[PDB]
Amino acid sequence: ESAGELLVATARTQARGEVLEEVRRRVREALEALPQKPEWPEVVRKLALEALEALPGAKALVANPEDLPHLEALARERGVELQAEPALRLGVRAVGAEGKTQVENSLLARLDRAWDALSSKVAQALWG
Amino acid sequence: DLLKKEYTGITYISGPLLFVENAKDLAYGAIVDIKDGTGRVRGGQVIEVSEEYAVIQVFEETTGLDLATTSVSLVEDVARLGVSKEMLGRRFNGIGKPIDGLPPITPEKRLPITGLPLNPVARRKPEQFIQTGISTIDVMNTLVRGQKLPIFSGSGLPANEIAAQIARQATVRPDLSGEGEKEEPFAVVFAAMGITQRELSYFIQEFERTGALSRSVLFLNKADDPTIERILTPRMALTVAEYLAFEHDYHVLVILTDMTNYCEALREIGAAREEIPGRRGYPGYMYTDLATIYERAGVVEGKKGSVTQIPILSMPDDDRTHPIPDLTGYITEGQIQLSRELHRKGIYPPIDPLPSLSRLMNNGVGKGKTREDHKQVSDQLYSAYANGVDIRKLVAIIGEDALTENDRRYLQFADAFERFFINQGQQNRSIEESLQIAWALLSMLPQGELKRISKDHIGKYYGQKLEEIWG
Amino acid sequence: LLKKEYTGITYISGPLLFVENAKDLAYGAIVDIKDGTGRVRGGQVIEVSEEYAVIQVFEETTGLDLATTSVSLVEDVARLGVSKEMLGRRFNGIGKPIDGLPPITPEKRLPITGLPLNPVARRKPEQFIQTGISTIDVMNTLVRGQKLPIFSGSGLPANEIAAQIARQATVRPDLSGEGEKEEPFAVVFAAMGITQRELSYFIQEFERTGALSRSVLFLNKADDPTIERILTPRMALTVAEYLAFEHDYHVLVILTDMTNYCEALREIGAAREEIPGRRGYPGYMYTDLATIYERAGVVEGKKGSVTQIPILSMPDDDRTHPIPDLTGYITEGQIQLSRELHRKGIYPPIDPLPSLSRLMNNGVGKGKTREDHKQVSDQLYSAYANGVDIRKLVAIIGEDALTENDRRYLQFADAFERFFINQGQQNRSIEESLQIAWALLSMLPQGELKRISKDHIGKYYGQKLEEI
Amino acid sequence: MIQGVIQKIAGPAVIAKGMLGARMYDICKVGEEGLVGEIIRLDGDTAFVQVYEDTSGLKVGEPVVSTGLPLAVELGPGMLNGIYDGIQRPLERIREKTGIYITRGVVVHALDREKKWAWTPMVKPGDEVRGGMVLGTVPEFGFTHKILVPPDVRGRVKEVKPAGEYTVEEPVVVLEDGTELKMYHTWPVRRARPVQRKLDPNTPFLTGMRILDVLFPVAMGGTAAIPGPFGAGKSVTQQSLAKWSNADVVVYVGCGERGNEMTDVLVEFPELTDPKTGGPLMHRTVLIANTSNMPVAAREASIYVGVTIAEYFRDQGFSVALMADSTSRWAEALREISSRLEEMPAEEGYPPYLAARLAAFYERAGKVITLGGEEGAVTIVGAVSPPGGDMSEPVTQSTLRIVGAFWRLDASLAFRRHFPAINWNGSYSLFTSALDPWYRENVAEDYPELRDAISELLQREAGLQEIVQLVGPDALQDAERLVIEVGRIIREDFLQQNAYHEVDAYCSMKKAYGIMKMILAFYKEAEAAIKRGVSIDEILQLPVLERIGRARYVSEEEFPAYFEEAMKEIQGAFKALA
Amino acid sequence: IPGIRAQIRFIQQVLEQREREDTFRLKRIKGKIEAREAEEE
Amino acid sequence: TEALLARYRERAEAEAKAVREKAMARLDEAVALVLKEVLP
Ligand SMILES: Nc1ncnc2c1ncn2[C@@H]1O[C@H](COP(=O)(O)OP(=O)(O)OP(=O)(O)O)[C@@H](O)[C@H]1O
Ligand SMILES: [Mg+2]
């Protein structure tokens, strides 16, 4: 007798999950398109500064080879070496003085770290 | 908050413990991800922090972890669980991740799993009588709403069936109490710590039969599951239960299937940490740790919800002196202790009433709550059953031929008690039926021996024979 | 032939000393410790590391010092020299002669720990050893390749039974059916913790009957170093294996007072500071005892055998003590002595009821003893157990209440105790023991012998106890 | 690969330096002769290695190479009719390579490489293949052995070999991505093999022993523990289970036990018949032997290897019985290795994770739907050897929390040579209520009721025994004497079973039902007669009791006629008494 | 009387075992602190 | 009978379609809002 209620509840839950997943996929596709926009240098600069101030005494800052040109001056003023790392994309990475600690600011990390907190906001905006 | 700091530099991996040196920014108690070379992510909690290194207890097996490609990253400083009213009808695993295939839930609050103490000033006195339908519990070991009443089981005793039956049959009696007549049901939170597939299959099948899986949250840590994940399961369950009860006015019934397994996990961690043990190797802080779980039940002034706990634990060798039952009984508000002797005789539920107890019983029985004769009837039943057991011991050494008439009446009472009050099978007995049976049984004794029952009650209820009920 | 000495001793406490630059000292290597006085005492490497190597010293560390002591390597693995000339000799448990005769020349140097026997190489024990004792030979037959212990007590005659079995043990090839030629039979006798009195007794018992000529005796005293006791069983079993599986011998090995062995094992372990087991005994006691007892057996493609008769004394007569308990888990049965039979003046005081031989079924019958053996043994067991049950039933209703069958069974139990068990120093043959058994059974009616085929009852029933 | 050098040797524990990068629970080869061991601790540049072989004669500085791979078994055709050691090394090959003694360091493949296998394809090119499917079949010993996809492998088929004779190494199928699927694959022994879903045990595991099969049943995917002191009959019980049970395959695991038992199995089973397929018994048996005097740490490997092979045959759709000869020896191995680690011990020196390991091992039992969709089960019977017979000990109590049946062996019964010597007062089974429908549809509609009646009679006799001994057999009443004698009959006519007798060693369910019905009919008639005034002695002197005595010795084919005759005779003899 | 004697012996054995385990633990921890002082002070 | 199950399936699918359309209504607005929120 409760089978119908269970089926309806499962359908509603999976539908809401599908809408949320669509939102997340769209935000992913948008974030990966950020570099092409003319404001990308500002984003790179701010992320690099956040990483540097979040890793006191950092030895070196690692960024995409195509992105270090936007970081040529910032590294010199802060006195930290730069390195070319093709694997990292749309993000910056920092390596500590000890060499055993590092900080990553890749936009995917930010997305998948703040998604849990922003899920309530997405839910209340979609189905408020 | 929005950035990922990764700690390479692990110096030690042995058993459940991991040491990471330069992690001076990890908070005490924080939750971390351990990423190995192959990319598998495993969890863990910080249980010691210093400028030298941080001790991390891992929540999974350490196979494949190396000191070169393994890294530790932070998830959060305080272990919190996302909590939504839409958790009802969902099945989660020990660490609270879905295992039913449905999408992860959207939280309304993220509450710490440890929780906080309930202020004694805020607490309300539990006074609502819950009818379980089992005479030994209802009449002699009454359960109220807002109580911690565990079941003390054995290796092969049917405690799981008793828990399933209590969940199936539980209800308040608004008619007998005088308060508003409402038929709101219980919301059942079910925490399985190291449960076998047989027991879990039984529980799931029973709940599906009763249609209670819609109003139940399940946190399942099986026997093949990691052992150190059991530290978090009861705390996640109680976080959910407290949320529902004291923010959405639910009456929550929480079942913690095997607390022995939990205590074993605690011992594993403590032994790894060189903690000074108490008795039988269990950590010295086991009492406090168990109180952090059991004391998360009750009722609060100015709110309509409640939390009720029915923990189930297996006494290792049917030993009540073992640390786990001992500390639990020192913490909880009574216990229902099963008996293997009654089990062998075929009595179900095999509940021995002499070692059982319900502290809060007097708050939920009497005039205006169940019935005026309740308390004195229970006291008299205990007296008569104790006399019967003593007379059995006397016969074991002297033989039936020497027994006086009153002694034989008490023996017959004990046997009839075991066969008609304790033994009920799967049957929902209203408190009135249970009192009627108790009275029919006490009628086997002369009027004057009922020293614990007031004269007026004796006049109003004594005399009916047991044949009037059956046959 | 050159030797390397180590002078880097940095620590000495208890039976351990540490050596600094002993990187080439193997784990399990035997060493020689030479002190300033020139005395040389031995030791063993129990742990080795880059920082130092730990050596356990066989004797007391009195007179050792960190300035003059030197350590040298004797051999990588403890070996022993074994020759066929060992027959007729005595040794001390290290292999050194103690009989005043020149030392033997070895034909091989065998490691004493021994390698495990592959299960695929073993063959099933299927032949019996005539011990000369009726209880063992009928009720609890010993099978070639078995390891059947005797469980004794504080004052019971374990030494006497060991000596008697060694003196009387034979192989009886005639009964094999094929009439095979006589096969060689030796007796290796391991004694541990034996006092001077018992050692004198055993020397006398082996010299009196000339059995010493076919025996190798490894005798360890109670004042000897503790580790010597540990090696005694391994030296004995090495000799036994050599004889059996390179000279087609049938060696019977008697190990006496394994309780003393376990006491020595506990002493050494506690010295090594290991986590204790049930009653202080090392947690590995079971494995150590298995490494001894699992060396008995018979191999496929060899004509020889190794049979073990460990002898134990149960503390407080407690069968649940770790020593008898772990021995029972390893061995293939048990012969148990009873104090009741001893207070009754019965020798040997073997109680058939709690005794058992697990391999007996496969070493009795046609071509091995004779066809009545198993049925007679089972029927004797039934009759004696029934008699004992009736005897304890007499503590209620009294003799006057017993029926005719009860009277017959009580009488059989008493006569069984008086004749089948009580045999003094007789060397009863298997045929003689079976005749005594049949005569005792004939007291009970022909119809109550439910476990004996009618043919055997007809063939052998009826003989009275005329032979006394 | 990662190369190091020995730094410290102590017992079976070797510490290797310069092993940074080596992973936990990864095999390595220790010493010049390549002794196999597993890593169980990582500290700095060092790795703690537990060795599955003797360590005597090793020196510091010797090489230590890590293999990068965990402890695994080779799963493929060639395991049946075979005897293996703890780490799956064929003992026949070891013998014919190195003689009657076991020497450390032998490198041999578990599955023979020079044998040709008749192979029949069942996958066409271009068919999608997922973990657990059957690519083809091969005849092994009368079994249709199915060649499986490794559980964690998905892909599409490019090429399939044709029907013919191939060795194990032959790639019989190649996926579109280049992965080569052979006749065998490896699997870590500490990871349970995946399944689609678990099921509720609803079919009996027929053991052939009346007491176990009647009073304390076990379902086909269930778990049983059989503790007992030495000399009780654990080994004989398990051998009888391996000889007469209705499992398609049996995996016998001797951990820390006698070698004469493995020799007995090997000598005897090749000349015994399979209960169902009618072929030699060995062809359905896998033997894992790590005797008492073999390396201690190999006991753990033996347990895990046995359970993994059992899981494999379950994944081929068989019903598999796993017999663990001594889990106590596995606990002892854990205790020793923890002593070398210097871990803080729980009760009686066992490590505090013993219960978790036992639980993981026992939880691999169950009736399941296989990844290929077929039905399979693994039934684990576990022997326990408590010190001194004390059942309050950690291994027994930790086993009692996970097993569904508890077959308690008793020293008192075993000393009076009453076998199987199962204490029916302290034993229990939790599959009695689940298997009732099967009993009703396969033995008789009233089987559960008669079984309950016999249990009740046994309980009543147990009660009456106390008064009998305290007061005397004669002083009792008469019906009480009938209860006592009928309990005697039940014990010595139904519960006893001679594992060495040619006929009594096995007993069908119908035979047990027949004996039960005969006993109960006798009891009802005797009660009536006592009411009628017949004396006890007259009842006991009846000759029909003797016919009930020899019932268990009657052959199965002859037993229904014997049962009809005895049923008629009970009535006929007890009616004329008047 | 013999039964009570057996019970007494069993209980005494269990208590002695618990005492031995406690002594082993105390030795371990005392060695731990001593080694700490000796090595890292 | 199976008519009740068919009706339940029909209503469940109708509800799924309705919620999907309700999402379609403001999916892009929600995506923009969350994007603005994540950025500083
Ligand atoms: N069912 C049986 N029928 C006949 N004899 C039996 C039976 N069970 C046990 N026995 C007898 O008991 C002897 C010991 O039994 P078994 O080898 O099975 O012991 P166990 O309980 O496994 O003990 P251990 O731990 O010493 O190996 C067997 O050799 C046989 O003599
Ligand atoms: Mg055994």
mmCIF file of N, CA and C in Angstrom, chain D residues 187-221:
data_model
loop_
_atom_site.group_PDB
_atom_site.id
_atom_site.type_symbol
_atom_site.label_atom_id
_atom_site.label_comp_id
_atom_site.label_asym_id
_atom_site.label_seq_id
_atom_site.Cartn_x
_atom_site.Cartn_y
_atom_site.Cartn_z
ATOM 1 N N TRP D 187 43.660 -12.501 -8.020
ATOM 2 C CA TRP D 187 42.752 -11.756 -7.195
ATOM 3 C C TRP D 187 43.345 -11.555 -5.807
ATOM 4 N N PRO D 188 43.319 -10.339 -5.265
ATOM 5 C CA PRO D 188 43.777 -10.136 -3.888
ATOM 6 C C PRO D 188 42.946 -10.934 -2.897
ATOM 7 N N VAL D 189 43.629 -11.599 -1.967
ATOM 8 C CA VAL D 189 42.951 -12.506 -1.049
ATOM 9 C C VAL D 189 42.332 -11.797 0.141
ATOM 10 N N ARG D 190 42.625 -10.516 0.342
ATOM 11 C CA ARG D 190 42.030 -9.737 1.416
ATOM 12 C C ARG D 190 40.838 -8.910 0.966
ATOM 13 N N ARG D 191 40.432 -9.024 -0.292
ATOM 14 C CA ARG D 191 39.276 -8.320 -0.820
ATOM 15 C C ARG D 191 38.217 -9.333 -1.216
ATOM 16 N N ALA D 192 37.011 -9.168 -0.694
ATOM 17 C CA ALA D 192 35.922 -10.043 -1.085
ATOM 18 C C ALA D 192 35.601 -9.840 -2.555
ATOM 19 N N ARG D 193 35.301 -10.930 -3.242
ATOM 20 C CA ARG D 193 34.943 -10.829 -4.647
ATOM 21 C C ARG D 193 33.511 -10.315 -4.786
ATOM 22 N N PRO D 194 33.252 -9.400 -5.718
ATOM 23 C CA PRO D 194 31.934 -8.758 -5.780
ATOM 24 C C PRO D 194 30.844 -9.708 -6.244
ATOM 25 N N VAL D 195 29.607 -9.347 -5.896
ATOM 26 C CA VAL D 195 28.411 -10.082 -6.289
ATOM 27 C C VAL D 195 27.325 -9.080 -6.649
ATOM 28 N N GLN D 196 26.305 -9.556 -7.367
ATOM 29 C CA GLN D 196 25.193 -8.678 -7.720
ATOM 30 C C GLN D 196 24.304 -8.392 -6.522
ATOM 31 N N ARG D 197 23.917 -9.426 -5.786
ATOM 32 C CA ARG D 197 23.023 -9.239 -4.654
ATOM 33 C C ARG D 197 23.098 -10.467 -3.764
ATOM 34 N N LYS D 198 22.758 -10.270 -2.497
ATOM 35 C CA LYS D 198 22.733 -11.335 -1.510
ATOM 36 C C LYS D 198 21.302 -11.802 -1.298
ATOM 37 N N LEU D 199 21.158 -13.072 -0.945
ATOM 38 C CA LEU D 199 19.860 -13.709 -0.834
ATOM 39 C C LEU D 199 19.656 -14.268 0.567
ATOM 40 N N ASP D 200 18.414 -14.659 0.836
ATOM 41 C CA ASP D 200 18.039 -15.209 2.128
ATOM 42 C C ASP D 200 18.198 -16.722 2.105
ATOM 43 N N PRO D 201 19.007 -17.312 2.982
ATOM 44 C CA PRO D 201 19.198 -18.768 2.936
ATOM 45 C C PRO D 201 17.896 -19.514 3.177
ATOM 46 N N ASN D 202 17.488 -20.309 2.185
ATOM 47 C CA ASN D 202 16.243 -21.059 2.267
ATOM 48 C C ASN D 202 16.388 -22.512 1.829
ATOM 49 N N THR D 203 17.610 -23.026 1.723
ATOM 50 C CA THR D 203 17.853 -24.415 1.377
ATOM 51 C C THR D 203 18.847 -25.012 2.364
ATOM 52 N N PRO D 204 18.648 -26.252 2.798
ATOM 53 C CA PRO D 204 19.548 -26.822 3.800
ATOM 54 C C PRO D 204 20.918 -27.136 3.229
ATOM 55 N N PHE D 205 21.913 -27.098 4.102
ATOM 56 C CA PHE D 205 23.239 -27.630 3.817
ATOM 57 C C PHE D 205 23.291 -29.020 4.433
ATOM 58 N N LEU D 206 23.082 -30.039 3.611
ATOM 59 C CA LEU D 206 22.959 -31.400 4.112
ATOM 60 C C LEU D 206 24.335 -31.960 4.437
ATOM 61 N N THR D 207 24.543 -32.302 5.705
ATOM 62 C CA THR D 207 25.834 -32.762 6.188
ATOM 63 C C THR D 207 25.940 -34.274 6.301
ATOM 64 N N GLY D 208 24.821 -34.984 6.345
ATOM 65 C CA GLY D 208 24.842 -36.414 6.547
ATOM 66 C C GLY D 208 24.905 -36.848 7.990
ATOM 67 N N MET D 209 24.917 -35.913 8.930
ATOM 68 C CA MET D 209 24.972 -36.208 10.354
ATOM 69 C C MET D 209 23.644 -35.803 10.970
ATOM 70 N N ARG D 210 22.983 -36.756 11.624
ATOM 71 C CA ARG D 210 21.596 -36.553 12.023
ATOM 72 C C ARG D 210 21.458 -35.408 13.015
ATOM 73 N N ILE D 211 22.341 -35.339 14.010
ATOM 74 C CA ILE D 211 22.206 -34.310 15.038
ATOM 75 C C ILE D 211 22.308 -32.922 14.417
ATOM 76 N N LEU D 212 23.314 -32.712 13.565
ATOM 77 C CA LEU D 212 23.487 -31.412 12.926
ATOM 78 C C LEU D 212 22.400 -31.145 11.893
ATOM 79 N N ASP D 213 22.035 -32.151 11.105
ATOM 80 C CA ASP D 213 21.075 -31.939 10.035
ATOM 81 C C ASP D 213 19.647 -31.810 10.535
ATOM 82 N N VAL D 214 19.367 -32.221 11.766
ATOM 83 C CA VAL D 214 18.018 -32.208 12.316
ATOM 84 C C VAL D 214 17.871 -31.135 13.387
ATOM 85 N N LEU D 215 18.636 -31.239 14.472
ATOM 86 C CA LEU D 215 18.396 -30.353 15.600
ATOM 87 C C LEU D 215 18.995 -28.970 15.396
ATOM 88 N N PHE D 216 20.129 -28.868 14.716
ATOM 89 C CA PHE D 216 20.832 -27.600 14.524
ATOM 90 C C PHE D 216 21.218 -27.458 13.059
ATOM 91 N N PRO D 217 20.249 -27.214 12.186
ATOM 92 C CA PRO D 217 20.548 -27.154 10.756
ATOM 93 C C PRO D 217 21.347 -25.915 10.387
ATOM 94 N N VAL D 218 21.913 -25.956 9.187
ATOM 95 C CA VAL D 218 22.588 -24.811 8.597
ATOM 96 C C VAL D 218 22.154 -24.704 7.147
ATOM 97 N N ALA D 219 21.866 -23.484 6.715
ATOM 98 C CA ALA D 219 21.447 -23.253 5.350
ATOM 99 C C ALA D 219 22.652 -23.238 4.413
ATOM 100 N N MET D 220 22.359 -23.340 3.116
ATOM 101 C CA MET D 220 23.401 -23.569 2.122
ATOM 102 C C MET D 220 24.400 -22.424 2.053
ATOM 103 N N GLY D 221 23.999 -21.218 2.432
ATOM 104 C CA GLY D 221 24.925 -20.107 2.463
ATOM 105 C C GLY D 221 25.236 -19.641 3.868
#
